[PDB]
């Protein structure tokens, strides 16, 4: 619930950033707005790349840390570690 709320607020603010970026530069805007052009499932898939160090997701480190802590707690409950 709250993870999705924060992610949506993130994308709301990123949309304002890229909409200024469009008025600054139109040619570069493609890569800015690709993750808005993508279907929602693809958007979730690109946004949920916190794992490992590929780290091409545009999400901030604090939001990454929230999911990482939740995943560690879930693994601890599951008994993996």
């Amino acid at each position: 619930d709250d993870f999705v709320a924060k992610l949506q607020d993130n994308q709301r603010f990123r949309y304002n950033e890229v909409m200024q970026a469009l008025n600054m530069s139109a040619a570069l805007t493609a890569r800015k707005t690709k993750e808005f052009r993508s279907p929602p499932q693809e958007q979730i898939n690109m946004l949920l790349n916190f794992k490992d160090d590929k780290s091409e997701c545009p999400c901030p480190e604090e939001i990454r840390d929230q999911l990482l802590d939740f995943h560690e707690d879930l693994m601890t409950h599951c008994g993996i570690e």
Binding site: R12, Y15, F36, I44
Partner: peptide, 19 residues
């Protein structure tokens, strides 16, 4: 082409679908 650039985002998406 701005219309083609702008598609459906999660922030416009409702809560439960995004969940």
């Amino acid at each position: 082409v701005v219309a083609c650039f702008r598609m459906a985002p999660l922030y416009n998406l409702p809560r439960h679908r995004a969940v």
